[PDB]
Amino acid sequence: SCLIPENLRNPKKVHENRLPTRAYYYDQDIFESLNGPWAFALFDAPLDAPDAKNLDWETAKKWSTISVPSHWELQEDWKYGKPIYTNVQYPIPIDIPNPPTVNPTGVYARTFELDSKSIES
């Protein structure tokens, strides 16, 4: 299935490059929040989303913003859809391990500042 990206239909692709899980401790001096407004665009499926290896901030600047954290089905005026409730039944067809081809894809973008000393320290 070349119309569905490989990593969305691979049960073994649990992550790529994720660090090993460790015990959680919040530390104010270490943790710096990136919550707030991010540039955001929603696409019908992966193939309509831009290549992120070529996405400028100059391009993403022009998008609407969404606030992180939040679900995109819970926005002012249901801008990016509405919530779906199912109990037992899957809301997709069962074709393990394929997801549906039309697969809502949201691209988030924001920037942050880094010091000369920061990268060194």
The contact set with a second copy (CB under 8 A) reads 25-30, 32-33, 35-37, 62, 64-65, 67-71, 73-74, 76, 82-89, 91, 113-118, 121
What is the DSSP-derived secondary structure letter of residue 51?
P
Between residues 7 and 35, which has the closer beta carbon with respect to a second copy? 35
Nearer to a second copy among residue 5 and residue 42 (C-beta): 42
Dihedral sign, Cα of residue 70, residue 76, residue 80, residue 85:
positive
Q: Residue 87 CB, nearest distance to a second copy (Å)?
A: 4
* CA atoms within a 13 Å half-sphere pointing along the CA-CB vector of 76: 4
